[PDB]
Amino acid sequence: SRGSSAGFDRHITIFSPEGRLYQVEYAFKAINQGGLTSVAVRGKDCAVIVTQKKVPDKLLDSSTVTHLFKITENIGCVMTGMTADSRSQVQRARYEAANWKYKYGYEIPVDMLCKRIADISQVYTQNAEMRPLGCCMILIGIDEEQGPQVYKCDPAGYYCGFKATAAGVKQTESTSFLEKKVKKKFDWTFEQTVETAITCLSTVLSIDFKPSEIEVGVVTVENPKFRILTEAEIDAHLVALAER
Amino acid sequence: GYDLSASTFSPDGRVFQVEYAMKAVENSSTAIGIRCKDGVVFGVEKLVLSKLYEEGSNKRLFNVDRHVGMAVAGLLADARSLADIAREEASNFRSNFGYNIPLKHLADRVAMYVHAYTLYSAVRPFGCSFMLGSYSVNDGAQLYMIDPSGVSYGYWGCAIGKARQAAKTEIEKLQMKEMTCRDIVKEVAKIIYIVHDEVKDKAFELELSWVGELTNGRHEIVPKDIREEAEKYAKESLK
Amino acid sequence: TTIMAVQFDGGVVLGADSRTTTGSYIANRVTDKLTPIHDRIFCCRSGSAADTQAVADAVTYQLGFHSIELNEPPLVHTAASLFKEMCYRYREDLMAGIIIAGWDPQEGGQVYSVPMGGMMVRQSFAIGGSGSSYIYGYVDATYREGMTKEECLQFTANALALAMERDGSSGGVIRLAAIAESGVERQVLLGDQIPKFAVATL
Amino acid sequence: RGYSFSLTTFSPSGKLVQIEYALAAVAGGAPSVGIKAANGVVLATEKKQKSILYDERSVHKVEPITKHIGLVYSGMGPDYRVLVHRARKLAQQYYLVYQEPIPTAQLVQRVASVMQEYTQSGGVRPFGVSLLICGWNEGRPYLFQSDPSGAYFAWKATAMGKNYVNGKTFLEKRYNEDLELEDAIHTAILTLKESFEGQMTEDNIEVGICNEAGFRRLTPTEVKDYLAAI
């Protein structure tokens, strides 16, 4: 023990002598290969997802570079990590939701959709012949009783609902920033939710964004349909922040 | 070693088999696509490895639907197989939904197929990158590129293969948003001649195709007379 | 059953009676036969209620999924094509006569018939169900190219009322829907709101 | 296709080391405790709950299988969710045939059998969890553990996860046969406090109880109340 290894325990998902799954651990490192960080925050009225948008190449059609995805009309997501893996997972999520509605006659709850994707990821941690997906999914939606929801699932098949969370390169620093900010807040709950998200991202990256360098997605209690902010909309938040 | 299977991550979170497949594309000669005002133009530096081969042998430009061209780099047998997958996907879409597959959806579907070959010891990743181009009045000009990992993005201009960077830097000089397909073909040819290493690889054929307002949204080979004029312009421009 | 739809400049009007029968028992007198398949695409159902409900649910699933993937509203033509594929493929195990109508940004208001057997044809206006027999002459004589929305609504309500008077297997209330870029407007004509045409006494 | 060979095999010395190594994942898991009182059963577990950012109510470690049976675990959470789902499905399969709720022991046997499969069947590793399963049937409480090999054991009281050896000796010197359920809840929470670290709140432990009326999680407010004494 302390980093020990036997047999094929670094190549396939079998247990190491401490009871670790190295291949799963390595899938978490794959999430950072992309170089990106995402933040998600929930208040009483809305839930928001913010991620970096990096378009290094001028020759890209930047309208096709996104990590924000509509899963259903009412469920949005931000993907962090290996892009093709992410897209696959988005497709599976879309399929699971559509299937749920066909079978059960009501929209899949965000928590259930997150659980389902996490359960599918679990299988890759126990069966030897395929790798985990090197990506992480953050879901937002409005639940009719519990309000705005933020859920995250990961390549180990863990999942959880959150007040706020993050993913990718600056996840730890985002988590620190968000913790420090909720403790301050009465009944431990975020109120300025889009500002917290952008501010968190800007602090941990040290950037001060242009409106073309982030993407923002939202769901609200008054407007549950998932919506992607335009550049001008995002600019209005950037300018409102810059002015105090 | 951590680089033998697409179902094994390295300790840093890489999938080396996918990276190795990318190296096969990167050893290949260069293909480019450019989207412009009224369509998309493709060009390939098609190395001729024997004089015994016919003109046109080992095409790297394919029709995958009547409105969709495909331009490839990498292992050619893998690319052709992907062209068959693309064809089947476009065909099935028409049968099921009753209209021509939108470019983006076709790109996303074939990309997921490519992606499926990056998860498993049972199969290997495709050793090819490919561009898809189309044009319609409703959707305009669209150019997508898909790599061995299964990532898919849209482009104004794109290049794949061994002189990729040199090609991109030449493509960046064009104001392609304001140019027509007829103007762009010449510039495609020009750029293939620029990035071609006449010392290291001796003989090539220029392959050109396009889809745009001028072909009524059909992907077609550039006519012979227009290709020859574009070559002559590229060659004289090299001077 | 009697079902109908009519195209106008900018949208469509759909209608149906509300009678469901087992033999000559009325098992539902206020049936809703106009079922939403997407935001601006409806189908009018006739034939087996089990069949048309199962088929409509399935198409709703397929179209919704397709629509999310494309990130665009779906084509009316696509909805009709999905009905057709399923109605044709399973023509030996289904009794379904469908009209698909709606609006999309590309082609505007559109009406498609998918009658039993699973052919598909676009029409200016369409009728179906058992009661349609009794209104071919009426719709043939009354239809005019270029009717407004309000005229399409009246023409529909009249046609359906006439069918309903004569067809034992049609009746109850008239359900109407108009579909356009702005949305879907539904209403019910009941009792004295149904158009009335005297019995011809001596 | 799927790998068709076993990933767990005998070592020369007769050990199934993948199952041992699964047990090491269990031992490193968060602590869980179960105590069988005279009139009921309590299951209690520590939440490995970092951050105030977690919504503690969003996922549960103490879970209902049926009206009369519930579970907790130590080890790998996602593996546990698999077994919770199968246990539920097993219970319903039984109910459809027999029209009687599955006896706790029968439910344990069928779940344990699934865990055994994953020690032999092709291309899979064992589950990295041990389960504590409580129930009430034939007018009487039951507490069982099921381990990654598929072995199961009936306990009066036990502990699993981090620091379980100590937890077990803490319960030896504290459990009595004639103990009531409410006292048992108190002693279960004290057993967690032996290895806690961090100050206990009603949000970072989870408690389930089982008696004649059925299985249920205690609510945050009920847990808060038991915590005042501790």
Place this chain on the structure above:
Amino acid sequence: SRRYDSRTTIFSPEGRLYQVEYAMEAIGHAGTCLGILANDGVLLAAERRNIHKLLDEVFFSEKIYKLNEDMACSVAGITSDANVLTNELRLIAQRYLLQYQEPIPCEQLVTALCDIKQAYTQFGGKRPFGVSLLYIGWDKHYGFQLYQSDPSGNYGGWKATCIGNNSAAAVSMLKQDYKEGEMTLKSALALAIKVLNKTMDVSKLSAEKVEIATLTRENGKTVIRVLKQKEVEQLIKKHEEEEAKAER
């Protein structure tokens, strides 16, 4: 995938099957389990490993399993594996009964299970079951019977035997005390206790630490009973009284 396949079902260079051997090492470390045949019956006696103070005691035994009306078994080795095999034994015995409308003869049930064990050593690429079993029974062809099987799919009939911890020592003591054709259930019981007393040398023998089942015939019916703790202490008492006689 050829790289990861540990090849459980192949020969080694001396014509050995390593897994089978290794599984046999697992068994040799498990709880001692003996079987003794008498004129009026057959018995099983086993070391309990479920002995911690906080255990609950909910079934009628730990390692003795009823197979059908006329047969029981005990096991030494991987418990979960034993649960699979004993479930399969019960199935086989009901399949027979369904088909022929008479109880499966003892040797036929053993052989059917042993054929499953054998398959696992020859094809399918899986680890064998890490279980040895002792089977006790009555049938109308050979009366009272005792069988032993191991992970090779091999089995044999015995008048007395032992599997599990200290087997070799237990068999020696059996070889010496067992009276072929002259044992009763009462003297087999005494002998079982004598043997466990020597072979549980970690440490001083107690009723909480052993399980004994008897198989007898009463009025044309097989009776299979697990002795209560009162009876087990009495036999332990009697053996300890007996060793007081041992010198004078």
Place this chain on the structure above:
Amino acid sequence: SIMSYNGGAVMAMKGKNCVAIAADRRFGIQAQMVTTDFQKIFPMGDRLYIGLAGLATDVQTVAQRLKFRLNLYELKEGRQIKPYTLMSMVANLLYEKRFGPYYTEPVIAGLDPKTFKPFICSLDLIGCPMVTDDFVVSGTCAEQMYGMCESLWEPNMDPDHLFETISQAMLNAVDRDAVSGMGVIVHIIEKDKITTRTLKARMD
């Protein structure tokens, strides 16, 4: 009718702390009697019996396949099956053949193995259960049986009165049915014993 190819009749009846189950003894093929000692009532526990009328081959198959399942259950579970649970097991066995059923319609009679409470039920051929507090009947003379039971049965009968009632209900019912009879067997089930009798009965 498939159900009358063999003829036959079974019934069960509840008394105070006891139950009774009875059957005719004929095995015949349409008009032809083949034997007069054909078993239709089978033990499923010390205090739990199942009676099957209908097609003789399915009477035997169901009894046998049921025993298979029950024996496995009892070995796996601690214990003797409860009457209500036996019913459910049988229902599930019959409904598996929903679209090609066994042609048999059983009655069950017993006492709960722990409480000794009386239980009786019957099922149709696809496994629909019916529990009653008085009697159940199944076979080619069900009308006749109903008429006798409705008229004679009373609540809370002692074992002797239960035996006379079920005996008179069977004998008189089968004597109006060409394809049932050739003897009657009756089991009375009590906490501490089973009493098995064959009745003096018409043999035509």
Place this chain on the structure above:
Amino acid sequence: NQYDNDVTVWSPQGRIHQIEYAMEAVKQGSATVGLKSKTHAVLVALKRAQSELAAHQKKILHVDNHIGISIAGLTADARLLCNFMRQECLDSRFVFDRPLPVSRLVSLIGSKTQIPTQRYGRRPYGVGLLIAGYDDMGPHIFQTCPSANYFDCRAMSIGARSQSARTYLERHMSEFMECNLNELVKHGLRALRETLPAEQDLTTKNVSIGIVGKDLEFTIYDDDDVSPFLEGLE
């Protein structure tokens, strides 16, 4: 090395050693030549004889009235592929009542032979073909490889010492289009003859010829039937 045993394992240079190794099976086969004019497509093959008393291995195979092949590499793989081609041709005549166009058949070969290069536990085909055909687009010579790539050729040679045959063919290929049939087969023979050790010669025992064209279904010439073509190598 760790990279050369599985067709599914890319090397760090972007190569697949199992496919390269399969191509060595063709390089070690006996040489064959294929060439075309405006009107005919010809195959010429050297047959290797095991002993001095063995017949000489068949190199040239009939596929359909309009298509024949020459092979180099594993003979069993050659037959498997040849049987696939035959069946594809029969299918097309059954369905459409017309010959399968040659370029389409070669496409089908590429697609069929690519599949095992991408699946674990499968292997490439260890054979290369020269394909002579005649259809509405005139005569063809195609070449197929274990890599599943294929080529449309003015002329070609594969097999042992085929470099020499390729050189000869480049030297004279501007003459081929206008050649009458005798001339064209003579060219095929002269090219093939360059592959031989200097002692040795083309004989009726070692040469096999296949010809198809506008007037002529795919026909194989062996033994005494090659003599007309061998005399007047003047």
Place this chain on the structure above:
Amino acid sequence: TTIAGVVYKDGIVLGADTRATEGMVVADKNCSKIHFISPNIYCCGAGTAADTDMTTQLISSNLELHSLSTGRLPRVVTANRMLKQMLFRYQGYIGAALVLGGVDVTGPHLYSIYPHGSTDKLPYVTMGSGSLAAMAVFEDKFRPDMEEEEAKNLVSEAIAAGIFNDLGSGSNIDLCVISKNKLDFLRPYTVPNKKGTRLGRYRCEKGTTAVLTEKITPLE
């Protein structure tokens, strides 16, 4: 069989008779036709008895798995979809004709479900051989937004109509009342039919039945 349901101001009232027949004989005088689906959802069944029992049990079990998973009270639409999709698949060979009622987060809902898989969502419905008698009562007397006791009166009247006018129906009236706050499973609600009493006695004394053979087997 006569089964029915109504939507009232605060909930659902379901109703059923208690006769089962085999041919034109009464097999059960007291069978239970109002089947549990979930704590907030019940379903009356008519048609082939084993099919109604088995269908409702299966869906109830799948719904319990669903609700265990979601942690939420199930929806009536979900039971409706699951029933109708299964019945459709079987093409009418599962002869279950159902009245499904409950109260969920969206309030009260009532559906009729036919063997071939069609469903109708309506404020009152009837099914079974007695369904026209019960429907006549509803058409004549139903009002929207009845109070609990009025709704229970109307449903029992409607079941009574089937009991007395349909040879397939009889014996008792069972009701189930479901609201946001309450589940009242009223079995029996009314017992409008009773066996007349017996005028003569046939208490046949020991020895009346002649016995050929006897075996007593003592038990533990």
